[PDB]
RNA sequence: UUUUUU
RNA sequence: UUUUUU
């Protein structure tokens, strides 16, 4: 298979009761995007210990794929591959 | 004032209980460019299991949020129950 | 006999389904220091999804419980519906 | 980050939360304990997460609308909590 | 169908079950109570289902590998259980 | 829309941890079937009070529809429209 | 002896966590007429969220039950993780 | 100090995730009348989905609890895995 | 089918 | 993301 796509951006929203949200992707494959793209993010894909969440606006890096949703994340970290911080 | 629009389901993930509506009319006027409106299963007017099916026509109230726009209450045309994809 | 108080929502977490009220009046007399009263979503008087918004004013019945106080029924001022923040 | 230590005051497994009696704040012993809210999601341990009344804990916390709210709770030395 | 009456012996809301002390079996008073298992799913009431220690109950039951196992539990007169 | 299809039969299996099972349909639209047809049944569709379940072999009547699953039930009762009995 | 077969996913309901495998080989021999084998998500060898995608090739162990036949452990070809439809 | 016993599964419900053991030996001495010991799925020594089958023989550590006895660790004879019945 | 997460 | 029901 082709290698998975990668990008970076920030959390648009994340609802912890729902257990999901969206990332605004502002860079893709190492190049800035003129127009940001929303990417779905589920709690199960967040790299961090304990309860998993993202804070609005928090910077993230991720791998993702195309789907019927548009685009969805496969694994999500903070900058530098650090754990996400969450709320 | 509560914001009102109409359109059709863009897509809906039945397992996760949410999707998006493509809004094609807002506040009584047609939109040339459709606008995505988030929709959660809990906001759907219908009996039994709540979901939407891609393409089904909807009328709804909504509000601005960090999601962009999100639904408050969603029905089919004329206030009919939504159909869904159970 | 149920105890009566009023105050405001201290906090409420909708994933948890509960929070605390800061009681600032008890049996009609004002308190200088607020008193914590537990509040479960199942006790909130309102339609739809039940929650409280931080700071919203509430009236309630409550009882003594092993570790403090727990509300039995919670309304807004005048017995109106709570407002919420889902 | 704020840190303290103490012991479980009480814990409610129906609702998934309790209180810690904080007896030291940032390494300074307190004459009287301070209440710290603790949700089950904060407890470092495998399986069903709870605290046993009186068990010793070490924790990070913050000021919030809850009062003092624990963020990550362990036993002594960073080891898992015991629970019931 | 077997029927009896009694009161809640104890109830565990973490695990969702308890025991009824059956003090009458098919309308006949018992010198000593008989244990009857009760799962939360059997309790006739709205909302969160539990029994309060000592609350009076009326119930159908059967013999099973549990011993005596309640099938539908109400309060006096077929009214809802009270719970905690 | 056309009226919903109806049939009768018996529970093939029902797993209460899963919350679902299958019905073996042996009559459809009031006529016996030479070859029985399996019809999915979810707990939410069982007409009865309290915890919802079917016992293996229990006789049922139901409305159903075609789906990607094959066929799935819309509402399930016992004989005569009586509540299901369950376990 | 544990029963072994191979085939492909017939269909799989991701929300409900189950489906059927169309078994086209059993105990080393080809089947002319495929045989339905129930499969639950809990029996799928793969990391992360467990499901199957319609048509994906599978190898599995199974047993007779009131379901007809049901899977005990399911992999892709050669023992590979299943692919799924998350 | 943990108490030791052996016996057999009285019943086990996999939706509940628990059951009871009938203890028929305590600290190596036989009992005429079996004694109930609660058993949670989380205490069962086996791979995969944890359960007990009615009548299967077990060995265990246990403790006194407020309403009876509760098992701490449960195995089959000789410390082998429990068998189960999912 | 003790998810205000059907 | 207190579902051995991810």
> What is the radius of gyration, based on Cα positions, of chain D?
11
The DSSP call for residue D45 is S
What does the alpha-carbon distance between residue E38 and residue E70 come to, in Å, rounded to a whole number? Answer: 5
Q: Tell me, in Å, how far CA of H82 is from C1' of I3?
A: 31
The nucleotide whose C1' lies nearest the CA of D45 is: J2
Residue F10, φ and ψ in degrees, nearest 5 = -145, 155
Report helix, strand or coil for B77: helix
Size of interface F-G (CB pairs under 8 A): 17
**First-last CA distance in chain F:** 36
What does the alpha-carbon distance between residue D43 and residue A15 come to, in Å, rounded to a whole number? Answer: 21
As a dihedral over the C-alpha atoms of residue H41, residue D43, residue E16, residue E29, rounded to 10 degrees, the angle is 100
What does the alpha-carbon distance between residue E71 and residue F17 come to, in Å, rounded to a whole number? Answer: 18
Give pairs for H18-25: CB < 8 Å, separation 24+. Answer: H18/E15, H19/H52, H20/E66, H21/H52, H21/H58, H21/H60, H21/H71, H21/H74, H23/H60, H23/H62, H23/H69
Cβ-based neighbour number of residue F22 at 10 Å:
26
User: Distance between alpha carbon G64 and the CA centroid of its chain, in Å?
Assistant: 14
* Residue with nearest Cα to nucleotide J5 C1': F18
Name, in order, each residue with C-beta under 8 angstroms of A44's C-beta and a sequence gap of 6 or more. Answer: A19, A52, G48, G49
Size of interface A-C (CB pairs under 8 A): 3
Report helix, strand or coil for G22: strand
Interface test with B, best of A11, A13, A54 (most B CBs within 10 A): A13
Cβ-based neighbour number of residue D73 at 10 Å:
26
Q: Which of B58, B36, B35, B54 has the alpha carbon at shortest distance from B45?
A: B58
**Contact with chain D for residue A51, Cβ under 8 A:** yes
What does the alpha-carbon distance between residue D22 and residue D45 come to, in Å, rounded to a whole number? Answer: 20
Name, in order, each residue with C-beta under 8 angstroms of G80's C-beta and a sequence gap of 6 or more. Answer: none
Cβ-based neighbour number of residue H65 at 10 Å:
11
Q: Tell me, in Å, how far CA of A62 is from C1' of J1?
A: 19
User: In angstroms, what CA-CA distances link D47 with D41, D43, D82, E14, E76?
Assistant: 11, 10, 11, 14, 40
User: Does the C-beta of F19 come within 7 A of strand J?
Assistant: yes
What does the alpha-carbon distance between residue C75 and residue H6 come to, in Å, rounded to a whole number? Answer: 55
Give A18-73 as a DSSP string. Answer: TTEEEEEEEEETTEEEEEEEEEEEEGGGB--SSS----TT-EEEEEEEEETTEEEE
Q: Which of C39, C46, C34, C36 has the alpha carbon at shortest distance from C16?
A: C39
Cβ-based neighbour number of residue A59 at 10 Å:
18
Strands (E), chain C: 3-13, 18-26, 29-40, 57-65, 68-75
* Residue G77 CB burial class (10 angstroms; 0-12, 13-18, ≥19): exposed
As a dihedral over the C-alpha atoms of residue B11, residue B14, residue B18, residue B20, rounded to 10 degrees, the angle is 10
What does the alpha-carbon distance between residue F51 and residue A12 come to, in Å, rounded to a whole number? Answer: 41
Cβ–Cβ < 8 Å for E70, E63 = no
What does the alpha-carbon distance between residue F62 and residue F28 come to, in Å, rounded to a whole number? Answer: 10
User: In angstroms, what CA-CA distances link A24 with A11, A31, A62, C6, F77?
Assistant: 6, 14, 11, 43, 49
Give the sign of the dihedral formed by CA F37, CA F43, CA F47, CA F51. Answer: positive
Which residue among B16, B65, B66 places its CB closest to the CB of A20? B16
What does the alpha-carbon distance between residue G22 and residue G57 come to, in Å, rounded to a whole number? Answer: 10
Report helix, strand or coil for D40: helix
Query: What top-level class would CATH report for the domain D1-84?
Result: mainly beta
What does the alpha-carbon distance between residue H80 and residue G40 come to, in Å, rounded to a whole number? Answer: 27
What does the alpha-carbon distance between residue B44 and residue B47 come to, in Å, rounded to a whole number? Answer: 9
Largest CA distance in chain H: 34
The DSSP call for residue G76 is S
What does the alpha-carbon distance between residue F77 and residue F84 come to, in Å, rounded to a whole number? Answer: 5
What does the alpha-carbon distance between residue E49 and residue E13 come to, in Å, rounded to a whole number? Answer: 9
Q: Tell me, in Å, how far CA of B42 is from C1' of I5?
A: 9
User: In angstroms, what CA-CA distances link A84 with C2, C5, D2, E69, G31?
Assistant: 46, 42, 19, 49, 51
What does the alpha-carbon distance between residue A3 and residue A9 come to, in Å, rounded to a whole number? Answer: 20
The count of C-alpha atoms lying within 13 angstroms of the C-alpha of A52, restricted to the half-sphere facing its C-beta, is 18
Q: Which of A36, A40, A50 has the alpha carbon at shortest distance from A18?
A: A40
Chain A positions touching C14 (Cβ under 8 A) are 17
User: Does the C-beta of A48 come within 7 A of strand J?
Assistant: no
Strand partners, A23: A11, A39
CATH number for the region F1-87 comes to 2.40.50.140
Residue C17: closest C-alpha in chain D: D15
Method: X-ray
What does the alpha-carbon distance between residue C50 and residue G26 come to, in Å, rounded to a whole number? Answer: 54
What does the alpha-carbon distance between residue F14 and residue F45 come to, in Å, rounded to a whole number? Answer: 13
Name, in order, each residue with C-beta under 8 angstroms of A34's C-beta and a sequence gap of 6 or more. Answer: none
List the Cα angle G1/G30/G53 in 5-degree steps.
Answer: 90
**Contact with chain A for residue B16, Cβ under 8 A:** yes
Interface test with H, best of F15, F17, F86 (most H CBs within 10 A): F17
What does the alpha-carbon distance between residue C34 and residue C21 come to, in Å, rounded to a whole number? Answer: 9
**Contact with chain B for residue A20, Cβ under 8 A:** yes
Cβ–Cβ < 8 Å for A25, A76 = no
Q: Which of D44, D48, D34, D40 has the alpha carbon at shortest distance from D5?
A: D34
Give B21-65 as a DSSP string. Answer: EEEEEETTEEEEEEEEEEEEGGGB--SSS----TT-EEEEEEEEE
Cβ–Cβ < 8 Å for D4, D61 = yes
Chain G positions touching B15 (Cβ under 8 A) are 14-15
What does the alpha-carbon distance between residue D34 and residue D25 come to, in Å, rounded to a whole number? Answer: 9
Cβ–Cβ < 8 Å for F80, F71 = no
Chain H positions touching E17 (Cβ under 8 A) are 16
* Residue with nearest Cα to nucleotide I2 C1': E48
Listed as ranges, the nucleotides of chain J within 7 A of a protein C-beta are: 1-6
What does the alpha-carbon distance between residue A35 and residue F43 come to, in Å, rounded to a whole number? Answer: 46
Name, in order, each residue with C-beta under 8 angstroms of E20's C-beta and a sequence gap of 6 or more. Answer: E6, E7, E8, E9, E35, E36, E37, E38, E51, E57, E59, E70, E73
Q: Does domain G1-86 have CATH number 2.30.30.140?
A: no
What does the alpha-carbon distance between residue D21 and residue D9 come to, in Å, rounded to a whole number? Answer: 5
* Residue H36 CB burial class (10 angstroms; 0-12, 13-18, ≥19): middle
Q: Tell me, in Å, how far CA of A27 is from C1' of J1?
A: 28
Q: Tell me, in Å, how far CA of H35 is from C1' of J5?
A: 31
Pairing of strands A70-77, A20-28: unpaired
Chain D positions touching C11 (Cβ under 8 A) are 64-66
Buried b (16+ CB within 10 A) or exposed e, F28-48: beeeeeeebbbbbbbbebbbb
Domain ranges in chain H are 1-86
Buried b (16+ CB within 10 A) or exposed e, C58-79: bbbebeeeeeebbbeebbbeee
* Residue with nearest Cα to nucleotide J4 C1': H49
Cβ-based neighbour number of residue A30 at 10 Å:
8
Report helix, strand or coil for E40: helix
Q: Which of D7, D25, D18 has the alpha carbon at shortest distance from D62?
A: D25
Chains A and D lie in contact, requiring 3 or more CB pairs less than 8 Å apart = yes
The DSSP call for residue H66 is T
**First-last CA distance in chain B:** 33
Residue C38: closest C-alpha in chain D: D15
**Contact with chain F for residue H11, Cβ under 8 A:** no
Cβ–Cβ < 8 Å for D5, C62 = no
Q: Give resolution, Å, one decimal.
A: 1.5
What does the alpha-carbon distance between residue E8 and residue E6 come to, in Å, rounded to a whole number? Answer: 7
Give D16-48 as a DSSP string. Answer: TEEEEEEEEETTEEEEEEEEEEEEGGGB-SSSS
Buried b (16+ CB within 10 A) or exposed e, B28-60: eeeeeeebbbbbbbebbbbeebbbbbeebbbbb
**Contact with chain E for residue F80, Cβ under 8 A:** no
Cβ-based neighbour number of residue H12 at 10 Å:
25
What does the alpha-carbon distance between residue F70 and residue G38 come to, in Å, rounded to a whole number? Answer: 13
Q: Where on the phi/psi map is residue F19: left (φ > 0), alpha (ψ -120 to 50), or beta?
A: left
**Contact with chain H for residue F17, Cβ under 8 A:** yes
The DSSP call for residue F1 is -
**Contact with chain B for residue A18, Cβ under 8 A:** yes
Buried b (16+ CB within 10 A) or exposed e, D27-54: eeeeeeebebbbbbbbbbbeeebbbeee
Q: Which of D19, C55, G42, F49 has the alpha carbon at shortest distance from H50?
A: G42
The nucleotide whose C1' lies nearest the CA of H44 is: J4
What does the alpha-carbon distance between residue F68 and residue G70 come to, in Å, rounded to a whole number? Answer: 20
Cβ–Cβ < 8 Å for H57, H8 = yes
The DSSP call for residue F84 is P
Cβ–Cβ < 8 Å for C45, C77 = no
Cβ–Cβ < 8 Å for D49, D43 = yes
The DSSP call for residue H80 is P
Cβ–Cβ < 8 Å for F83, F50 = no
What does the alpha-carbon distance between residue F64 and residue F7 come to, in Å, rounded to a whole number? Answer: 8
What does the alpha-carbon distance between residue B41 and residue B48 come to, in Å, rounded to a whole number? Answer: 11
Interface test with D, best of E12, E14, E50 (most D CBs within 10 A): E14
Strands (E), chain F: 5-15, 20-28, 31-42, 59-67, 70-77
What does the alpha-carbon distance between residue E55 and residue E79 come to, in Å, rounded to a whole number? Answer: 12
The nucleotide whose C1' lies nearest the CA of D15 is: J2
User: Distance between alpha carbon D81 and the CA centroid of its chain, in Å?
Assistant: 9
What does the alpha-carbon distance between residue G64 and residue G50 come to, in Å, rounded to a whole number? Answer: 23
Report helix, strand or coil for C6: strand
Near-strand I residues (CB closer than 7 A): A 17-19; B 14, 17, 41-42, 49-51; C 14-15, 17, 41, 49-51; E 13, 16, 40-41, 48-50; F 16, 19, 43-44, 51-53
What does the alpha-carbon distance between residue E48 and residue B51 come to, in Å, rounded to a whole number? Answer: 26
What does the alpha-carbon distance between residue C27 and residue F24 come to, in Å, rounded to a whole number? Answer: 63
């Amino acid at each position: 298979d082709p290698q998975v796509l990668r990008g970076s951006g920030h959390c648009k929203w994340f609802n912890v009761r729902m257990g999901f949200g969206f990332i605004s992707m502002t860079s893709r494959e190492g190049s800035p995007l003129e127009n940001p793209v929303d990417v779905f993010v589920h709690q199960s894909k967040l790299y961090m210990e304990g309860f998993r969440s993202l804070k609005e606006g928090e910077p993230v890096e991720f791998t993702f794929k195309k789907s019927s949703k548009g685009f969805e994340s496969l694994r999500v970290t903070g900058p530098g591959g650090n754990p996400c911080l969450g709320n």
